[PDB]
């Protein structure tokens, strides 16, 4: 209730990002939010002396009927001073993902209960846009924590501790982690059980709060149960030219990941100028080479750490038939996780509501096992991804990304 | 009396560090003094400015301009350097409404508020650095100084701060006759509904009750603007649209200056005229930027411009925008990247119309144009009328489905439908998934000296068939791209390609139709003509037969 100081970054100034357009349906959906908000004190109308902008729009939660406003507060999550004062930084949990269950919860609500720095509030600046700018786009600014704001957890931080400090005493197993408006709760429980700690969870803050609109609701994920993709050879009774050709071209390629691959027998194989779908049998040395290549692709990379003070990176491939691939990496060659989605739900025409699934999954991820998201190399136009991201997305938090241009090779090889 | 509510100041602040402006106030004459100085005093009478003592250490200056024609004289403060110290403001014009979103209105009545406009408030604590001097006649006694009061005309915050102060004050009214559309342009609110004639004029009158609490009086003698209105470029009518007169002149020689403003014409006319195409044109000011150079048309461009004149005949309008029915867009191939399309309701009656051109890339096809194009005039649709159009297009829904499943990336196009109108858009090739049975096989490859530009394009197949081809002036990426090509030259019409060119592959890999290097042209127009091809990929140097062999015949 006392304001926390908060200030920018050094000669840098507030954030002047351009408001997308907006929907019908999302525009009359922010102006029912925002008229509420600003009944309940938590934004006010600005003048024209604040010439501040983060984009907004709104989106629908993880099976929710309701609207929900996200705020684009990247910029200025950018901008915003670092919050080391009273902790250089709770040290990430490298529990949390190996928990059977790992509920996450939105939590974002709570942060309106503590007023923003009356200072700071002109940096939250946001536009309502009308349809063909036909009236004046409405102005407001935040006097609360923002939801998506670097700042709110870190300023919440002292009073998150305070309200879930009975659940922790009483469930010490329970690994509890908080990144931006959500919360992620594992435990080694039944199912039952767990869903049953959660909703007592959910009470210790309706308890304080005494109503969160969204608190209600539960992504339930299982880090245990967690796939990776190792590097996997065909085993053919058949080799054709092509099978024997594919071969040395994933063996080159992981080469550069293994250091003792061997391909010098494989390629003798190939001697003379064969037609690609002759068969060759495999001589004894081949198989030995194919054999002993087998076994280095089964021990993990060697010299693979995390340094928490590199970007993560992470990449994905479209695969076909609704299956994509995907690997996360500070250092080329240095895979800190690999994977591979099919499930993707509801998009079996639509590639781009796959790719944004994809993408939020695996920044889901990433903040499990990390503590913070990557940054993504996307294959896709930026143009086709900027006009239809925002019709598909349901988490509370935006990563970065660019954009693949040229189709990579790497494709076959994670095929 | 009648209490007035007054207008609250908006704070100004200057740009961080900077201090106000101390400028010299230039000589004028004795007659320009005189005149300065009567309409000073009359603004003063006003309370547009006031008289300041000599603390006040800023200073901007002022001219006297003569209206041309008229004995009468015109003050004018240039604030250009307070202009630069002052901070930066929202501006909420930036947006301009498309005539095609708006909405069919049987009345539009126009007031007067330029009342308003030179009697909106100033920052107080902001004045002193409005502050300018009247010289002195013979500069023999201290020249007059006076600050604004009111927003100065010509200073940054004047056009925002007056916006804003007036939104706020209509807002209630909006709000509170949701029948009536309220616009400000300059000085007028533009007011304009649906209602019966004596029914609006009353909502005008309210208007002018309630801009009364603010003192803002508004002229009795109704504003000699009525429909059509002459507005940012376009014509308005109560039930139609379109942009103003677009008038191609006669030129017997055309220099780079004209050219850039003809196409600036024929772009601004492309939204409501269809068809219009400029790439030709366009081409025209390819690289050079001297206005005054003179460039011959080519053929190709007289043709563009002749076409152009015969769209721009006679008037075309375009009508406003009907919430209860749905938008449809419908786009045709024009050639050489261009796109043109329409955007309508009702059949034969335009929202408005548009184009598009490829973007600058060294390869490309029509199927990605095209995408380009949709999420263009969908992101464009969403600006002007919130919602995606569904989409009539010339392309098959099975050359679409085969395109999305076996393109390398994601990609998308919102509910749509074919529209059979030629030239359709359609997949020219497709490689095999797989190496393909009875057919020959050609192991490829080029290499180059990097010195002297010598180079070779070869191939050899699983049947003997060999070529090696001497080249001159070429590289090792042109020369792997020729030895694809001598191979789709000289074999069947199922051919299986082995390659380890990467950079081929990954040209071929993107599936253009169409490219800036004519040997990808040649390539293309070859596998145009095959029943089936398979292109494999292997890496160089690693002993694999048949790459290994002609490898060495082309880097001899
Ligand atoms: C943008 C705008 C410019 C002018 C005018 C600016 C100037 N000069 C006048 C008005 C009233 C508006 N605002 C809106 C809003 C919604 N529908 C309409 N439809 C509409 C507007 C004018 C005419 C006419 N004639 C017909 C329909 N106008
Ligand atoms: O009374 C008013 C005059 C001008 C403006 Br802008 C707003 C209110
Ligand atoms: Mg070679």
């Not at chain 1, 600005?46 to 609207?67: C, H, L, M, Q, R």
């Not at chain 2, 307070?82 to 498309?98: A, C, M, S, Y």
């Not at chain 2, 002018?208 to 009795?220: A, E, N, S």
């Amino acid at each position: 209730i006392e304001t926390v100081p908060v200030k920018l970054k050094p000669g840098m100034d507030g954030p002047k990002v351009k408001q997308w357009p907006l929907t019908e349906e999302k525009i009359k959906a922010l102006v029912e939010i925002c008229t509420e908000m600003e009944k309940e004190g938590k934004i006010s109308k600005i003048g024209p002396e604040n010439p501040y902008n983060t984009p907004v729009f709104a989106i629908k939660k993880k099976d929710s009927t309701k609207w929900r406003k996200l705020v684009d507060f990247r910029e200025l999550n950018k901008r915003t001073q670092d919050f080391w004062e009273v902790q250089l930084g709770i040290p990430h949990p490298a529990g949390l993902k190996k928990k059977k269950s790992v509920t996450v919860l939105d939590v974002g609500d709570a942060y309106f209960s503590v007023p923003l720095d009356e200072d700071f509030r002109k940096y939250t600046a946001f536009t309502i846009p009308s349809i063909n700018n036909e009236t004046p786009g409405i102005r407001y600014q935040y006097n609360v924590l923002p939801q998506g704001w670097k700042g709110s957890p870190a300023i919440f931080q002292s009073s998150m501790t305070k309200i879930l400090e009975p659940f922790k005493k009483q469930n010490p197993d329970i690994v509890i982690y908080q990144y931006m408006d959500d919360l992620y709760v594992g435990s080694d429980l039944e199912i039952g059980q767990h869903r049953t700690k959660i909703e007592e969870l959910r009470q210790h803050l309706l308890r304080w709060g005494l109503e969160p609109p969204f608190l209600w609701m539960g992504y339930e994920l299982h880090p245990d149960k967690w796939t990776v993709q190792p590097i996997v050879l065909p085993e053919k009774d058949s080799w054709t030219v092509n099978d024997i050709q594919k071969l040395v071209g994933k063996l080159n390629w992981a080469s550069q990941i293994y250091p003792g691959i061997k391909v010098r027998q494989l390629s003798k194989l190939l001697r003379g100028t064969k037609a690609l779908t002759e068969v060759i049998p495999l001589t004894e040395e081949a198989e030995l080479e194919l054999a002993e290549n087998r076994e280095i692709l089964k021990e993990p990379v060697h010299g693979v750490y995390y340094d928490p003070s590199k970007d993560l990176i992470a990449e994905i491939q479209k695969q076909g038939q609704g299956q994509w691939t995907y690997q996360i990496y500070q250092e080329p060659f240095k895979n800190l996780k690999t994977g591979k989605y099919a499930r993707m739900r509801g998009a079996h025409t639509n590639d781009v509501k796959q790719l944004t699934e994809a993408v939020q999954k695996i920044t889901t991820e990433s903040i499990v096992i990390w503590g913070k998201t990557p940054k993504f190399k996307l294959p896709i136009q930026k143009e086709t991804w900027e006009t239809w991201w925002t019709e598909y997305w349901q988490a509370t938090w935006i990563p970065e990304w660019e954009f693949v241009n040229t189709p990579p090779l790497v494709k076959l090889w994670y095929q | 009396m009648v209490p007035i509510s007054p207008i609250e100041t908006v704070p100004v602040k200057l740009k961080p560090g900077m201090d106000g402006p101390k400028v010299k106030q230039w000589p004028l004459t004795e007659e320009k003094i005189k005149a300065l100085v009567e309409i000073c005093t009359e603004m003063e009478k006003e309370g547009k400015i006031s008289k300041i003592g000599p603390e006040n250490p800023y200073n901007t200056p002022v001219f006297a301009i003569k209206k041309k024609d008229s004995t009468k004289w015109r003050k004018l403060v240039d604030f250009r350097e307070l202009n630069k110290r002052t901070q930066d403001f929202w501006e909420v014009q930036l947006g301009i409404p498309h005539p095609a979103g708006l909405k069919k209105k049987k009345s539009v009545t126009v007031l007067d508020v330029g009342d308003a406009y030179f009697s909106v408030p100033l920052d107080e604590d902001f004045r002193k650095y409005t502050a300018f001097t009247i010289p002195s006649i013979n500069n023999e006694t201290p020249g007059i100084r006076y600050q604004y009061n009111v927003l100065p005309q010509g200073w940054k915050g004047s056009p925002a701060i007056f916006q804003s102060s007036m939104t706020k004050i209509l807002e209630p009214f909006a709000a509170q006759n949701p029948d009536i559309v309220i616009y400000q342009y300059m000085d007028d609110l533009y007011v304009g509904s649906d209602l019966e004639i004596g029914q609006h004029r009353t909502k005008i009158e309210e208007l002018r009750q309630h801009l009364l609490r603010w003192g803002l009086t508004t002229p009795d003698k109704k504003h000699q603007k009525e429909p059509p209105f002459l507005w940012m470029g376009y014509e308005l009518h109560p039930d139609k649209w379109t942009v103003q007169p677009i008038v191609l002149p006669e030129k017997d020689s055309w220099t780079v200056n004209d050219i850039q403003k003809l196409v600036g014409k024929l772009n601004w006319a492309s939204q409501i005229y269809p068809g219009i195409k400029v790439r030709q044109l366009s081409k025209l000011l390819r690289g050079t930027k001297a206005l005054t150079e003179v460039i011959p048309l080519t053929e190709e461009a007289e043709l563009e411009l002749a076409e152009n004149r015969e769209i721009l005949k006679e008037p075309v309008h375009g009508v406003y925008y009907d919430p209860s029915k749905d938008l449809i867009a419908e786009i045709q191939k024009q050639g050489q990247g261009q796109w043109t399309y329409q955007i309508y309701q009702e059949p034969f009656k335009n929202l408005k119309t548009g184009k598009y051109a490829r973007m600058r890339g060294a390869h490309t096809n029509d199927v990605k144009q095209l995408t380009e194009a949709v999420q263009k005039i969908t992101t464009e649709s969403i600006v002007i009328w919130g919602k995606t159009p569904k989409f009539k297009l010339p392309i098959q829904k099975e050359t679409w489905e085969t395109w999305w499943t076996e393109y390398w990336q994601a990609t998308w196009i919102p509910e749509w439908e074919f529209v059979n109108t030629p030239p359709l858009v359609k997949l020219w090739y497709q490689l095999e998934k797989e190496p393909i049975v009875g057919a020959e096989t050609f192991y490829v490859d080029g290499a180059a000296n990097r010195e002297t530009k010598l180079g070779k394009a070869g191939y050899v197949t699983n049947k003997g068939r060999q070529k090696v081809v001497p080249l001159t002036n070429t590289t090792n990426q042109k020369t792997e791209l020729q030895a694809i090509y001598l191979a789709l030259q000289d074999s069947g019409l199922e051919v299986n390609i082995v390659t380890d060119s990467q950079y081929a592959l990954g040209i071929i890999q993107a599936q253009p139709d169409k490219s800036e290097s004519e040997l990808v042209n040649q390539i293309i127009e070859q596998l145009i003509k095959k029943e089936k091809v398979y292109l494999a990929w292997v890496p160089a140097h690693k002993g694999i037969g048949g790459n290994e062999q002609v490898d060495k015949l082309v880097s001899a």
